[PDB]
Amino acid sequence: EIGTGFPFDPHYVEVLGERMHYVDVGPRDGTPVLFLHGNPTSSYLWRNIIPHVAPSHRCIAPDLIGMGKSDKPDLDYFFDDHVRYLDAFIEALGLEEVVLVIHDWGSALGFHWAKRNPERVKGIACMEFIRPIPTWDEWPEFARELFQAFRTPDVGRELIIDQNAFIEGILPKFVVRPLTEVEMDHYREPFLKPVDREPLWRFPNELPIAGEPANIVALVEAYMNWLHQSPVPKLLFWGTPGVLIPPAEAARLAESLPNCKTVDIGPGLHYLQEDNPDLIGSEIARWLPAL
Amino acid sequence: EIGTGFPFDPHYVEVLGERMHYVDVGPRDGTPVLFLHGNPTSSYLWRNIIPHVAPSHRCIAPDLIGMGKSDKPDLDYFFDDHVRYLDAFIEALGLEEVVLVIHDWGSALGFHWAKRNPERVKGIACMEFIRPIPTWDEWPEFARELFQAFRTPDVGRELIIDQNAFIEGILPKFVVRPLTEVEMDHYREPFLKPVDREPLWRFPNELPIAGEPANIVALVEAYMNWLHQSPVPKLLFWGTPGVLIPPAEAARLAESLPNCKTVDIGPGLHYLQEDNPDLIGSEIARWLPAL
């Protein structure tokens, strides 16, 4: 049966400013065995291996920096930071030769230390260690999406805020005729500073798609249900194939909205003003006096 | 031949502490025609339609707050923000009755204003306007992925820091037998503060998959090539089906790594310690004296 206790006594050491924790049991002559844990574990992972090894060798299992009972200093916790703090943990204990028992990122660390002090590593016990993974096909399928998600950053902000996707990508995507550089530079001009793209990223995150955001969903619903009953003269322009108002939806609204005249601007996506402003303008002009 | 220039003298109005640009052309009296642009455009979007309406009617084309030549305050730029600024802008100019010409988020503003001020809207010309989108199948396929991307947050950080996925999700996912609540509480204790979950999240983002990060890929490739030529004794534990080291890969590293004994721990995924610690310690301890 697998035991749940952590029956080891806390041993602390100061190193590069931080107090790290490590279990230390076993004798003090000969070769120590250094137990290196991974993510999101700590020395507790070894609680039921160590007692088999303790009655013969020194068992040293440290809590990696920022984990376990070691102190949690505010830094990135890059791999090269665990490297710095572990090297420094080893020497802070004066360890000479060691036998390594490693797992996971513990194994990236142990292996990497052993390559940098080969003369000093007398044996390596490993399990489930980090090799390179050439393709995502070799990650087990039941875990692939989860680990693919873990490496997904702020995709929306990176497209819109960083790469300016709504100017550089959506405008030409959503106009049928090609825009010109002069036109695109007019469009680029108010968002040359990335920080100013905040509204260009909040807008699509505010769209009423699949029930969210709920507030905007209900507000749009309410004005659309006002619109469906109001006798206000309405002029709907629509293009083929459109984006938000595809041709079949323009037809339905033609009879679905009171007192609504619709106009076929021809081939259009989203910015119909940029594919056929002449027809949109003249039809507005002709429709106005009749109000 | 579509016009590229913007031949409009700039008008400005002071609306809730912020200067707002607007186009103002055409006769004074009569019912004004108010053009509302959307994302990510401005009154420039309207530039070739206005020439058709200006002969007969006043044309007012504001640049929404944060956009065009209008002031860029430090808002989040929610829809509610624009509703506050547009409303004040309409009142700032004294507009009584209007005719809206609206598109995109301009249409969401115009419609929502008109619903609150119906007796003030003499007409509505609209194009590609915002209505509730029930499912993502309603969105054009050629743009579906891009707009879902726009609405993707920091998926990695929300799972690991906010939702604690490596502790609540990966640990039981990666251990064949069930963890008890006491064991889960030992694993939870280092990171009850979500800010302290930094390494939990940076570790999977450091894994060497698909060449990223290139530097961790190289460092791990170096100690692996070192390992394949080093004669240090190695004891490789592995389970079925494993995660990082499946049975067949274990089998090949039995031959590929010199001075290597291999121990099948039986069923197992990634935290083999938690599936067969006795066999692991037992075999380490019988391996140690022969070092």
Side-chain angles (χ1 to χ4, degrees):
Chain A
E1 197 188 328
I2 302 110
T4 66
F6 198 56
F8 294 110
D9 262 15
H11 292 122
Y12 300 103
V13 55
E14 301 286 320
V15 48
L16 315 175
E18 307 303 320
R19 192 195 62 163
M20 295 175 58
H21 168 279
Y22 62 97
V23 48
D24 205 344
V25 297
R28 213 223 194 155
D29 51 25
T31 320
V33 180
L34 176 62
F35 283 97
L36 293 200
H37 74 79
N39 183 34
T41 52
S42 72
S43 50
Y44 183 84
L45 186 58
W46 299 111
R47 68 201 184 278
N48 299 305
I49 286 135
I50 282 168
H52 292 254
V53 174
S56 81
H57 302 66
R58 205 181 179 202
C59 283
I60 292 160
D63 290 353
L64 297 190
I65 194 45
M67 329 193 48
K69 185 40 168 309
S70 324
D71 279 359
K72 332 241 180 287
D74 172 74
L75 52 154
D76 290 345
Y77 293 98
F78 272 97
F79 172 76
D80 285 79
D81 290 353
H82 289 292
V83 162
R84 257 190 328 118
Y85 269 76
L86 176 74
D87 292 350
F89 167 95
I90 289 171
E91 317 297 13
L93 293 214
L95 297 187
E96 234 162 281
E97 286 110 332
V98 280
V99 153
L100 293 167
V101 173
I102 55 185
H103 180 221
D104 189 30
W105 279 102
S107 87
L109 292 172
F111 277 152
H112 177 62
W113 189 86
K115 191 204 92 183
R116 281 177 310 136
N117 322 276
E119 77 270 350
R120 207 172 338 166
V121 66
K122 271 162 172 189
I124 291 162
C126 57
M127 59 214 75
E128 275 280 295
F129 57 102
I130 293 173
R131 299 172 303 175
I133 319 289
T135 185
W136 273 105
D137 266 318
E138 284 130 6
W139 202 268
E141 192 176 26
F142 77 99
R144 198 180 292 160
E145 171 62 37
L146 254 181
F147 273 83
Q148 262 153 4
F150 292 160
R151 295 159 61 95
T152 305
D154 207 319
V155 160
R157 296 188 69 80
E158 263 171 30
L159 287 165
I160 297 165
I161 302 272
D162 285 338
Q163 313 158 54
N164 205 11
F166 223 118
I167 307 278
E168 303 303 329
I170 303 288
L171 293 170
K173 267 180 195 272
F174 276 3
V175 169
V176 178
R177 58 135 294 214
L179 289 152
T180 79
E181 316 83 292
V182 163
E183 262 148 346
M184 291 292 248
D185 276 334
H186 273 283
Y187 276 131
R188 289 169 189 125
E189 169 77 26
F191 313 106
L192 294 183
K193 285 163 51 151
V195 73
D196 289 335
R197 284 141 202 192
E198 213 44 45
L200 313 188
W201 166 86
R202 181 56 72 175
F203 268 140
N205 272 275
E206 283 273 90
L207 285 161
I209 309 184
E212 280 139 349
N215 57 316
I216 301 312
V217 152
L219 174 148
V220 163
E221 269 173 24
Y223 73 56
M224 283 305 299
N225 274 103
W226 168 90
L227 188 74
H228 269 110
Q229 62 66 28
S230 191
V232 80
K234 328 185 184 49
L235 175 57
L236 181 65
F237 301 90
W238 64 269
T240 297
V243 177
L244 301 176
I245 301 284
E249 289 301 322
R252 309 190 225 254
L253 297 170
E255 284 284 274
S256 174
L257 306 161
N259 200 32
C260 161
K261 178 191 171 94
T262 70
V263 175
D264 187 357
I265 67 132
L269 275 158
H270 183 65
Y271 303 93
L272 316 169
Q273 301 96 333
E274 294 281 13
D275 273 300
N276 200 350
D278 283 341
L279 186 56
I280 285 162
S282 48
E283 284 300 302
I284 292 169
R286 203 160 56 101
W287 165 80
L288 280 180
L291 297 184
Chain B
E1 182 48 288
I2 297 186
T4 63
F6 195 65
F8 305 97
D9 292 317
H11 303 59
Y12 300 89
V13 53
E14 176 83 10
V15 174
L16 323 182
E18 316 295 323
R19 186 178 94 168
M20 281 214 246
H21 175 248
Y22 56 109
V23 177
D24 210 350
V25 282
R28 288 301 95 177
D29 64 354
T31 301
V33 182
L34 177 66
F35 299 74
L36 303 186
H37 76 83
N39 200 42
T41 50
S42 48
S43 70
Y44 183 91
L45 174 65
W46 294 118
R47 83 199 164 278
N48 297 328
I49 287 144
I50 279 146
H52 292 267
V53 183
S56 89
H57 286 68
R58 195 190 178 177
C59 295
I60 302 174
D63 288 345
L64 310 182
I65 198 58
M67 322 200 65
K69 291 171 223 254
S70 312
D71 272 344
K72 288 157 168 70
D74 201 302
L75 311 159
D76 306 312
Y77 286 98
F78 275 73
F79 174 71
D80 184 271
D81 292 336
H82 288 294
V83 166
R84 279 188 302 102
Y85 275 80
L86 178 75
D87 282 20
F89 166 92
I90 292 174
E91 307 310 73
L93 254 52
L95 305 194
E96 275 145 27
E97 74 285 325
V98 281
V99 158
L100 305 159
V101 174
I102 55 180
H103 172 242
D104 183 61
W105 278 107
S107 88
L109 296 162
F111 283 139
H112 176 63
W113 189 84
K115 157 198 121 201
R116 305 180 275 133
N117 309 88
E119 76 302 339
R120 281 169 67 181
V121 191
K122 189 182 189 177
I124 300 185
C126 57
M127 55 224 92
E128 272 286 304
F129 64 95
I130 282 168
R131 65 208 296 225
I133 292 131
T135 83
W136 279 104
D137 289 317
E138 304 289 33
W139 198 268
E141 182 176 41
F142 82 99
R144 204 168 299 149
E145 213 298 286
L146 192 46
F147 265 77
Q148 287 165 338
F150 288 163
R151 283 153 77 80
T152 305
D154 201 325
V155 159
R157 300 197 46 90
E158 288 190 334
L159 278 170
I160 303 202
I161 289 111
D162 297 350
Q163 306 182 35
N164 204 8
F166 256 94
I167 287 147
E168 301 297 342
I170 291 305
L171 276 174
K173 274 210 181 53
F174 274 7
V175 171
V176 173
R177 57 103 176 168
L179 294 174
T180 77
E181 263 290 82
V182 164
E183 292 168 314
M184 287 300 282
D185 276 324
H186 274 264
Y187 279 117
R188 278 170 194 136
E189 186 133 81
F191 325 91
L192 307 153
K193 264 94 170 171
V195 288
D196 294 324
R197 285 158 201 172
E198 268 334 287
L200 307 189
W201 169 83
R202 194 143 275 282
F203 263 143
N205 272 290
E206 288 282 75
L207 270 307
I209 311 134
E212 291 197 290
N215 67 304
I216 295 317
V217 163
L219 173 161
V220 171
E221 257 156 339
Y223 67 59
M224 280 300 297
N225 281 278
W226 167 82
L227 196 73
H228 280 279
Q229 56 90 1
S230 151
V232 295
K234 308 148 198 82
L235 189 66
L236 176 50
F237 298 86
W238 64 280
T240 315
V243 175
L244 298 185
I245 311 270
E249 264 320 288
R252 284 187 273 270
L253 300 144
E255 302 296 316
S256 324
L257 307 170
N259 209 10
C260 195
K261 187 204 180 225
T262 279
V263 185
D264 171 10
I265 63 129
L269 284 150
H270 182 69
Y271 303 98
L272 319 180
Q273 302 81 2
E274 297 283 8
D275 272 310
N276 205 354
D278 292 345
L279 181 62
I280 280 168
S282 147
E283 288 279 311
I284 297 195
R286 300 188 338 143
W287 172 70
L288 278 178
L291 289 314

